[PDB]
């Protein structure tokens, strides 16, 4: 297992963009963290993985205290991370984008390092872009490599930040199938997208977070029929 974050806080210019957030996620279930372009569901993702130093928080991988470990030390304990700000290597190929994170995980030989990259490019349908470039990719095609590169590290506790940011209507129901086939193999992710019809139909819980605070938490069939959620999120009259 259980990654746990307790009482995080962050303030930039004395603004306090994050307030008493507290989210816990087990291994084997996927959890939403939703809200408007206020709350800081990325600054919470920054303080868990460890890019910005927290101010009052406490991060625990089920018995430990990793709250003062650097960024790379948490990535080897199991925390994976998919950023929002369009991060591919841009001059390696797509085959080398997947292979550059498979030169880690010292349990794969030269055999199963080669048929993992050739299998990850089948379940994402990017096999016709086998060696194009990083720069000459296109929007959702750039997004389908960054997800495939993040699942190639074999982590636990993935923190997927905007996976479906302008992908497809088809490749989302193809990503959602292979984010549940990894859920059954003991891996619990934290999806935080904005189209709340693909993210709420795959999650088991949710944490609707407004300007700095939790305002709701529960089942996905509960989050829609809360009226304070429909005021600051969800639009109006949503199914």
């Amino acid at each position: 297992a259980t990654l746990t974050a307790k009482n995080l806080a962050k303030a930039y210019k004395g603004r306090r963009v994050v307030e008493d957030v507290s989210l816990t996620v087990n291994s084997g279930e996927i959890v939403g963290l939703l809200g408007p372009n206020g709350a800081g569901k990325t600054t919470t993702f920054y303080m868990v993985v460890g890019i910005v130093p927290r101010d009052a928080g406490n991060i625990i991988i089920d018995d430990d205290d990793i709250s003062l470990l650097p960024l790379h030390a948490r990535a080897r304990r199991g925390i994976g991370y998919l950023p929002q700000e369009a991060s591919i290597f841009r001059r390696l190929s797509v085959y080398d984008n997947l292979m550059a994170v498979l030169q880690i995980r010292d349990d794969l030989s030269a055999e199963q390092r080669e048929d993992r990259a050739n299998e990850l490019m089948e379940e994402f349908h990017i096999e016709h872009l086998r060696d194009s470039m990083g720069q000459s990719l296109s929007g959702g095609e750039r997004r389908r490599v960054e997800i495939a590169r993040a699942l190639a590290a074999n982590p636990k506790f993935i923190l997927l930040d905007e996976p479906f940011a302008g992908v497809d209507p088809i490749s989302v129901i193809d990503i959602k199938r292979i984010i549940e086939h990894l859920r059954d193999s003991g891996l619990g992710v934290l999806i935080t997208d904005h189209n709340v019809r693909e993210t709420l139909a795959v999650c088991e819980r949710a944490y609707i977070v407004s300007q700095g605070h939790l305002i709701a938490h529960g089942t996905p069939t509960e989050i829609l029929q809360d009226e304070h959620v429909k005021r600051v999120y969800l639009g109006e009259d949503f199914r």
Binding site: V49, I51, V52, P70, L71, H72, A73, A75, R76, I79, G80, Y81, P83, E85, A86, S87, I88, F89, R90, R91, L92, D96, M99, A100, V101, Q103, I104, R105, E146, R149, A150, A152, A153
Partner: protein
């Protein structure tokens, strides 16, 4: 396969910062020629040689500078595009782009060593023969009082190794804010090196101080600066 990518982005920007820096500093040595052709009352037969043989005195100061100013240009390019935050968050630590900034530091320290003992003296046996004391090759045979060489011929190679190491932690300045202007503390430190270490041989050489005791307590204090600033995660 990611050390090969960190190499070919610095080595493609080290060459393009070496030639551009050589053409700027040789056009200056080409326009003083016009100040030494008409009013100097000498002909123009020697400038064609003197351009190509004026190089290895010049390409021994900028050959360290074409390294660490090529690392800042291509690590800062890899931080604003968030290419290293995915390198950390998939495994490998900060001790891989130290390991990658020391593979091609060997590639420069080889060329900067050929320049300092096989073309340094070769220039002054062709600058003193056409267009007219301490320019031998090996000095472990004599015991002369000019021990500036073998402590200045040598530490133009440790300068390549050390300045490549002190600029790995000076590049990480770009998460989501701040300036790209990080070339100033690296360049202001490279001035302080060559105002002391290459000039501790003419006021502290030639029979004033020992240029083996003082030409390494400047060089090793300036190397432990490149380690305690790189190891800033388990300080206390």
């Amino acid at each position: 396969i990611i050390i090969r990518y960190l190499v070919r982005e610095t080595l493609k920007s080290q060459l393009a910062i070496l030639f551009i820096l050589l053409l700027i500093f040789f056009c200056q040595k080409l326009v003083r020629i016009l100040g030494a052709a008409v009013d100097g009352d000498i002909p123009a037969n020697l400038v064609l040689s003197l351009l190509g043989l004026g190089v290895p005195e010049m390409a021994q100061l900028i050959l360290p500078l074409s390294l660490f100013l090529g690392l800042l240009m291509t690590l800062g390019k890899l931080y604003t595009e968030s290419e290293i935050t995915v390198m950390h968050a998939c495994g490998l630590s900060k001790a891989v782009l130290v390991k990658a900034a020391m593979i091609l530091a060997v590639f420069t320290a080889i060329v900067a060593a050929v320049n300092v003992m096989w073309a340094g003296p070769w220039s002054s046996r062709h600058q003193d023969e056409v267009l007219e004391m301490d320019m031998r090759t090996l000095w472990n045979t004599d015991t002369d009082r000019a021990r500036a060489e073998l402590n200045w011929r040598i530490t133009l190679v440790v300068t390549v190794f050390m300045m490549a190491l002190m600029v790995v932690p000076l590049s990480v300045v770009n998460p989501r804010q701040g300036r790209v202007l990080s070339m100033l503390p690296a360049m202001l430190l490279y001035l302080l090196f060559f105002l002391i270490q290459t000039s501790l041989k003419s006021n502290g050489g030639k029979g004033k101080l020992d240029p083996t005791l003082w030409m390494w307590t400047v060089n090793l204090i300036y190397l432990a600066l490149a380690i305690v600033l790189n190891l800033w995660d388990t300080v206390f």
